[PDB]
Nanobody, 124 residues
Framework: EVQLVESGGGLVQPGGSLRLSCAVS????????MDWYRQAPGKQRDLVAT???????NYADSVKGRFTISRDNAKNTLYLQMNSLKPEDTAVYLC??????????????????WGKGALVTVSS
């Protein structure tokens, strides 16, 4: 079983910083896509950042210049460095992973895994 565990969450003041990490139970260097999602109370999940196998990254416009995603292949850990946090950043942050390039979405049960999430609270 592939398992994800998020850490590094908590309460911070506006403009503060947090580094989220997700430990993966398997080697991550060949994992196709590793994502950070977030879900604010009463709202839908949004994709925050994505790290692809080929080294490329995608960011939501709302977190560009503030958030940084990266893989630590040696530790099998996905990081989310969060600087200049805002009240609107308050959400449960969830790590997500797609082991395989799955164009037709035929191997969801085998390739897609979610973490339980880590709560991030930004207020003064």
């Amino acid at each position: 079983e592939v398992q994800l565990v998020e850490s590094g969450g908590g309460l911070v003041q506006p403009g503060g910083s947090l580094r989220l990490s997700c430990a993966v139970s398997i080697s991550i260097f060949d994992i196709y896509a590793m994502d950070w999602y977030r879900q604010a109370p009463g709202k839908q999940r949004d994709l925050v950042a994505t790290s692809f196998r080929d080294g490329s990254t995608n960011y939501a416009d709302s977190v560009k210049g503030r958030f940084t995603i990266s893989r630590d292949n040696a530790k099998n850990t996905l990081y989310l460095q969060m600087n200049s946090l805002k009240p609107e950043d308050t959400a449960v942050y969830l790590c997500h992973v797609s082991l395989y390039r799955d164009p037709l979405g035929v191997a969801g049960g085998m390739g897609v895994y979610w973490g339980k999430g880590a709560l991030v609270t930004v207020s003064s």
